[PDB]
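agent: user wants the structure for Beta-lactamase from Escherichia coli. delegating to structure tool.
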Amino acid sequence: QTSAVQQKLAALEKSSGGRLGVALIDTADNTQVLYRGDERFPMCSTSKVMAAAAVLKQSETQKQLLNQPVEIKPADLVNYNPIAEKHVNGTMTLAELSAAALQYSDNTAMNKLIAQLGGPGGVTAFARAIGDETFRLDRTAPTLNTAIPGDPRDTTTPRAMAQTLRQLTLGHALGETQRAQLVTWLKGNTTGAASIRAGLPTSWTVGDKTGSGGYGTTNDIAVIWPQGRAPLVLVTYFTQPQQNAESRRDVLASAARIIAEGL
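agent: tool returned. relaying tokens verbatim.
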């Protein structure tokens, strides 16, 4: 029952010391369970899904776009870029950049995707094109994770992001080849084992994208294919009052467990 789940989520938030935002879409009956579902949260690297999806949308009309080489230059390097730094003064294809951004949260890769879309305004324009009026990307990858309270830059709501993730992976926002590619990348994520995945049965298939940033911001957005029932879309956003708070992936796992046990 939704109220029971929301009460548990409220208990989770209270014990966590932070602010918790949850949106669950159960596609079996299109019920939605929200907790702070219309509050804005910093997206951090969960925004990489929109950027990958927008480049996939570009490739629907620019054939072979994903195989185009992109130069990685020293000026592209930033703090966290475990794939792209191995290609400085070389190239990576836009497919490789998308995979690196999604599966390793590589921030140089994300910056190349943002640039390929015409800047943060271009990523935001893609969101608007697919009916997301809430998402806003305002900054490039080495600064969009500051997650300062009160700062509307690089934020969305749980409800908006769950609706958009559903449209991208289970709906028709992308062509079929592109949708399959996005889902393949998300299923291959390497950074999510402690977040939503840790609160779910291992026999369920998950595609997800984590995010983290300042103020102990710890996020995860996921498409879930349980056994025995239709897919779920789950967004879990979490942020804390101290600028130097530690990440709490285990809180997202608890959110996912409450959802997976209660609905």
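agent: one observation worth passing along. The chain has one domain: 2-262.
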